[PDB]
Ligand binder design. Structure first.
Ligand SMILES: *[C@@H]1O[C@H](CO)[C@@H](O[C@@H]2O[C@H](CO)[C@@H](O)[C@H](O)[C@H]2NC(C)=O)[C@H](O)[C@H]1NC(C)=O
Ligand SMILES: *[C@@H]1O[C@H](CO[C@H]2O[C@@H](C)[C@@H](O)[C@@H](O)[C@@H]2O)[C@@H](O)[C@H](O)[C@H]1NC(C)=O
Ligand SMILES: *[C@@H]1O[C@H](CO)[C@@H](O)[C@H](O)[C@H]1NC(C)=O
Ligand SMILES: *[C@@H]1O[C@H](CO)[C@@H](O)[C@H](O)[C@H]1NC(C)=O
Ligand SMILES: *[C@@H]1O[C@H](CO)[C@@H](O)[C@H](O)[C@H]1NC(C)=O
Ligand SMILES: *[C@@H]1O[C@H](CO)[C@@H](O)[C@H](O)[C@H]1NC(C)=O
Ligand SMILES: [Zn+2]
Lengths: 596, 195
C-alpha cells in the first residue's frame, strides 16, 4: 500500500491508455503528412487536441504522488517525466500572453518578407530568394543587402517581443524551481540518484566549454584557411588578420560554412565521389535504396524492417493531386508500427538519407519494449547521433565499392581525401563555435548577466571573439539578430547540435574499434561487423531507462562527452591545415571591423 | 462415426475476451486430432504431456476447448508456469497441464480501421488466478486505501481494459485467436476416443 506501489499501479493504467491515444494522433497526423486535405488538417488537430488534453489531465493526477516517497528509480523517472508543470505553473493571463508572443514571433520569421529598394513590388522571403543570395551569390554589396535587410525588418519586429519572451520564460522556470529558463533547458542532461553516473545541470556549461577549448586549434586553422581563401575572392573587403565578415559565410546567419566549398576546395580539378550517375545507370528505384539500407543494418546484427514498415511507409512521392510534406522523417507510431515518410529520388544524397532515417527506426524499434514514457534517445542529442553514424559508414569509398556503385578501379589518393574532409569540416566543425556561442549568449541573457541595453553589443562581441565573425554594418539595440534565426525566435534549445556532434564521433570511433578498422577513422565501415552492432545495440535498447552517461558508456566506455574522437576524425585535415597556414596568421583580432 | 464438433470452436464468428474465456465441453464423439496439427494453419501448436504425433490413439473422459483472443506478444503466457497479466489475471494454466495450446493470427477478422475495442482483458486483480479459474467481475479496484464506492477516481480503476486492435499494428500488438484443449482422464466411460 506504499505510495510507490500506488504510483506503479497508476503508471500501469496510464501506459495502456496512452499507447492507443498516441496511435490515433500519430496515424491521423500521418494522414495529413501523406495526404494534405483540409479534412485531415482538422482530423490531425482533433486527435492531437485529445492527446494534448489527456496528458494535461494525467500530468495533474501524477503530481498527487510526491516523488520524495518513490525509491524505485525507474518509477521516479516516468513519474517525474509526467509531473512537468510547464507553462501551466504561470497565471492563465500570463501563460496566454507567452503563447501569444511565441506565436507572434513564429509568424514574423516564417512570414517575414524583404522587398527591393526602389521597387516595392519586388520582394524576397528567406526562402527561396534571400537564402539563395547568401548561400550562392558572390557580391559583397549584394550580400550585405540580404544579410542586413533580414535583420532590420524581421529582427527589429522581434526585439520587443523577445524581451517579454525572456521575462515570462524566466518566470515559468523560477516557479518550476529552476534558476532561469536556461537552467531549465540544461535539465535535459541532469541525472540524480545513480552513484557514479549523476550529472549536474551546470556541469554541461563546464563540459561544453572544457571541450570547446580543445576544438579551438582545429577551428583556428580552418578559420585562417577559409579567411585566406575568401581574401582571394573579395580582396578589397577582407582583412588578413581580422574576423570574417558575417555575410560572406554561406548562410544568412553564418551557421554552416558548407556553401563556401566552391571557394575553399583544396584541389578543385579532382571531383567529388558522386554515385548518383551509377545508380541511374543500374535503374535503381526507391525500394532498392531502402532495401540496401536494410541490408546494411542486418549485416551488423540488427533486425530487418517490419512488414508494416514496407506496407505503410511512403518511400516515393505520390505526386499529382496527392500533395505531401516531403521532409524525410522517421515515424514511431507505437503498437509496433514503424514508418518512413520520404519522397525518395535516385541520388546519392537521398541514398545516405535513407540510411540516416532508417537509423532512427532502428533506435525506435530497439527501445520499444521499454515503458511508454521511456521510449526516446538517452538525451536530446542521442537520437540524431545514431542517425548520423549510418551515413558516415554508408558514404565511404570502401562501402560504395562493396555494393557495386563505385567502380573497383577507384582508389583513394591523399588529395580527394582532403577535399571531402574539408566539406565535412565546413559543416561539422564550422557550426560548433556558432552553436556554442549562440547558446552561451542565450544562457547568459536568461541568467541576467547581460542587460537589455547591451543584448546586441554583447552578441557581436562574442561573435568576434568566439566565432571569429564580424558584422559588416554597426548594429544598435533596436536589432535582435540572434532572433533572425529560426531556433531562437521559435523557442528551441540549440546546444543539442553541439552535444550531438561530439556524440556521433565518440559513437563512430568506438564502433569502428570493434570492427578493428586499420587506418584513419575517415574511411571506416562498420558493415559486416556484428561486434560493432552489439555494442551499439546495448545502448539503443536503454532508451531513457538509464542515465545518458551510462547509456554513452555502453558504447564508448567513457561516462562523458569528449571531442578527441571528432579531432581524430579530422587529424589528417588538421595537419594539412597546419601546412597550408605556415605563412598565414592563425587567429583573429577583435577590433578590426569593415564598418569603420 | 459421430465426429467431434471442432468446427464450432475454431471457425466461430466471434471469440471471447480472455477474462471471460469460453469453455466448450466435448463428449461422446470421434476427434481426428491429426487433421489440426497437420493442417499448417496455426502459428502456434505446442502440446504438453501428450504428443500431437498421432496420439489420437488414446481415449479420454472429457475434452474441453477453451477459446479467447489476446495479442501476439501475450501468447507465450498460455503455457505452464508463465507469468504476466494474462497468466495471472485472465487465464492460468496449471503446472502439470496435459493438453495443447493452439493460436493463429486474426488480423483479418478482429482488427478494424480505427480500432476494434470489443476484446478486453483484466488489468488489475487482488491475487493471481487459480488454474482454469474464470473471473468476470467488474468491481472497482482499490489501489490506495480509501473505499471507491463503486466509481473510479483517484487510485480507483475499472479492472477491465479494452484491447485496441488495429490492422496497422505490429505483429505483437495484433490480435490472435487461441484454443486450449484440456484432456481429462477420470474413472469413467471415456467417451472421446477418436482413433
Ligand atoms: C522497479 O519496478 C519494476 C517494475 O516493472 C521492476 O521491473 C520488473 O521486475 C520484475 C522482477 O521479477 C520482472 O519480472 C519484470 O519483468 C520487471 N518489469 C520491467 C518493466 O522491467 C524493477 O526491477 C524495479 N527496480 C527496482 C530497483 O526497484
Ligand atoms: C474451417 O473452415 C475451413 C474452410 O473449408 C471449408 O469448410 C466449410 C465448413 C465451409 O466453411 C467452407 O466455406 C470452407 O471453404 C475448413 O477447411 C477447416 O477445416 C474448418 N475448421 C475445422 C476445425 O475443420
Ligand atoms: C486523402 O484524404 C481525402 C479526404 O479525406 C480522402 O477522400 C482520400 O481517400 C485520401 N487519400 C488517400 C490516402 O486514400
Ligand atoms: C509544480 O511542480 C512541482 C513538482 O512537480 C509540484 O510540487 C507543484 O505542485 C507543481 N505546481 C503546479 C500547480 O503544477
Ligand atoms: C526478415 O527476416 C525474417 C527472418 O529473420 C524473415 O522471415 C523475413 O522474411 C525477412 N524479411 C526480408 C524482407 O528479408
Ligand atoms: C559481407 O560478406 C558477404 C558474404 O561473404 C559479402 O558478399 C559482402 O560483400 C560483404 N559485405 C561487404 C560490405 O562487402
Ligand atoms: Zn535524423
Amino acid at each position: 500500500s506504499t505510495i510507490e506501489e500506488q504510483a506503479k499501479t497508476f503508471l500501469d493504467k496510464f501506459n495502456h491508455e496512452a499507447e492507443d491515444l498516441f496511435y490515433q494522433s500519430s496515424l491521423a497526423s500521418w494522414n495529413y503528412n501523406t495526404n494534405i486535405t483540409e479534412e485531415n488538417v482538422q482530423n490531425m488537430n482533433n486527435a492531437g487536441d485529445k492527446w494534448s488534453a489527456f496528458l494535461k489531465e494525467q500530468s495533474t493526477l501524477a503530481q498527487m504522488y510526491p516523488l520524495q516517497e518513490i525509491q524505485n528509480l525507474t518509477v521516479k523517472l516516468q513519474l517525474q517525466a509526467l509531473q512537468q508543470n510547464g507553462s501551466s505553473v504561470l497565471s492563465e493571463d500570463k501563460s496566454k500572453r507567452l503563447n501569444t508572443i511565441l506565436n507572434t514571433m513564429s509568424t514574423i520569421y516564417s512570414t517575414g518578407k524583404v522587398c527591393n529598394p526602389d521597387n516595392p513590388q519586388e520582394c524576397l522571403l528567406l526562402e527561396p530568394g534571400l537564402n539563395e543570395i547568401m548561400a550562392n551569390s558572390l557580391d559583397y554589396n549584394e550580400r550585405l543587402w540580404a544579410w542586413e535587410s533580414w535583420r532590420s525588418e524581421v529582427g527589429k519586429q522581434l526585439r520587443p517581443l523577445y524581451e517579454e519572451y525572456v521575462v515570462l520564460k524566466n518566470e515559468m522556470a523560477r516557479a518550476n524551481h529552476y534558476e532561469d529558463y536556461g537552467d531549465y533547458w540544461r535539465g535535459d542532461y541532469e541525472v540524480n540518484g545513480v552513484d557514479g553516473y549523476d550529472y549536474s545541470r551546470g556541469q554541461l556549461i563546464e563540459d561544453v566549454e572544457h571541450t570547446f577549448e580543445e576544438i579551438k586549434p582545429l577551428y583556428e586553422h580552418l578559420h585562417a584557411y577559409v579567411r585566406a581563401k575568401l581574401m582571394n575572392a573579395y580582396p578589397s573587403y577582407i582583412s588578413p588578420i581580422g574576423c570574417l565578415p558575417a555575410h560572406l559565410l554561406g548562410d544568412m546567419w553564418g551557421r554552416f560554412w558548407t556553401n563556401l566549398y566552391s571557394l575553399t576546395v583544396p584541389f578543385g580539378q579532382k571531383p567529388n565521389i558522386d554515385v548518383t550517375d551509377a545508380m541511374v545507370d543500374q535503374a535503381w528505384d526507391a525500394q532498392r535504396i531502402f532495401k540496401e539500407a536494410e541490408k546494411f543494418f542486418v549485416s551488423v546484427g540488427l533486425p530487418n524492417m517490419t512488414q508494416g514498415f514496407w506496407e505503410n511507409s511512403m518511400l516515393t512521392d505520390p505526386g499529382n493531386v496527392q500533395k505531401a510534406v516531403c521532409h524525410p522523417t522517421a515515424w514511431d507510431l507505437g503498437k509496433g508500427d514503424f514508418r518512413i515518410l520520404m519522397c525518395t529520388k535516385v541520388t546519392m544524397d537521398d541514398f545516405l538519407t535513407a540510411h540516416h532515417e532508417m537509423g532512427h527506426i532502428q533506435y525506435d524499434m530497439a527501445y520499444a519494449a521499454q515503458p511508454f514514457l521511456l521510449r526516446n534517445g538517452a538525451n536530446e542529442g542521442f537520437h540524431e547521433a545514431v542517425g548520423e553514424i549510418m551515413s558516415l559508414s554508408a558514404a565511404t569509398p570502401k562501402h560504395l565499392k562493396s555494393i557495386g556503385l563505385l567502380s573497383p578501379d577507384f582508389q583513394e589518393d591523399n588529395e580527394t581525401e582532403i577535399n571531402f574532409l574539408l566539406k565535412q569540416a565546413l559543416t561539422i566543425v564550422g557550426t560548433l563555435p556558432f552553436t556554442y556561442m549562440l547558446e552561451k549568449w542565450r544562457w547568459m541573457v536568461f541568467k541576467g548577466e547581460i542587460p537589455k541595453d547591451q543584448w546586441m553589443k554583447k552578441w557581436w562581441e562574442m561573435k568576434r571573439e568566439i566565432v571569429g565573425v564580424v558584422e559588416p554594418v554597426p548594429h544598435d539595440e533596436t536589432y535582435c539578430d540572434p532572433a533572425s534565426l529560426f531556433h531562437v525566435s521559435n523557442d528551441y534549445s540549440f546546444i543539442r547540435y553541439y552535444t550531438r556532434t561530439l556524440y556521433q564521433f565518440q559513437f563512430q570511433e568506438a564502433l569502428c574499434q570493434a570492427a578493428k578498422h586499420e587506418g584513419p577513422l575517415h574511411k571506416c565501415d562498420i558493415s559486416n561487423s556484428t561486434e560493432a552492432g552489439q555494442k551499439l545495440f546495448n545502448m539503443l535498447r536503454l532508451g531513457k531507462s538509464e542515465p545518458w552517461t551510462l547509456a554513452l558508456e555502453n558504447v564508448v566506455g567513457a561516462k562523458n562527452m569528449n571531442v578527441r574522437p571528432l579531432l581524430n576524425y579530422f587529424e589528417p585535415l588538421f595537419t594539412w591545415l597546419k601546412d597550408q597556414n605556415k605563412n598565414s596568421f592563425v587567429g583573429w583580432s577583435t577590433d578590426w571591423s569593415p564598418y569603420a | 462415426t459421430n465426429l467431434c464438433p471442432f468446427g464450432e470452436v475454431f471457425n466461430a464468428t466471434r471469440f471471447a475476451s480472455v477474462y471471460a474465456w469460453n469453455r466448450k465441453r466435448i463428449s461422446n464423439c470421434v476427434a481426428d486430432y491429426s487433421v489440426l496439427y497437420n493442417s499448417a494453419s496455426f502459428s502456434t501448436f505446442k502440446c504438453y504431456g501428450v504428443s500431437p504425433t498421432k496420439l489420437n490413439d488414446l481415449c479420454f473422459t472429457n475434452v474441453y476447448a477453451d477459446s479467447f483472443v489476446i495479442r501476439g506478444d501475450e501468447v507465450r503466457q498460455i503455457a505452464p508456469g508463465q507469468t504476466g497479466k494474462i497468466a495471472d489475471y485472465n487465464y492460468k494454466l496449471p503446472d502439470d497441464f496435459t493438453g495443447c495450446v493452439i493460436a493463429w493470427n486474426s488480423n483479418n477478422l478482429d482488427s478494424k480501421v480505427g480500432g476494434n475495442y470489443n476484446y478486453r482483458y483484466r488489468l488489475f486483480r487482488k491475487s493471481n488466478l487459480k488454474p482454469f479459474e474464470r473471473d468476470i467481475s467488474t468491481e472497482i479496484y482499490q489501489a490506495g486505501s480509501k473505499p471507491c464506492n463503486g466509481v473510479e477516481g483517484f487510485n480507483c480503476y475499472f479492472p477491465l481494459q479494452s484491447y485496441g486492435f488495429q490492422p496497422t499494428n505490429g505483429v505483437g500488438y495484433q490480435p490472435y485467436r487461441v484454443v486450449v484443449l484440456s484432456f481429462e482422464l477420470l474413472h469413467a466411460p471415456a467417451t472421446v476416443c477418436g482413433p
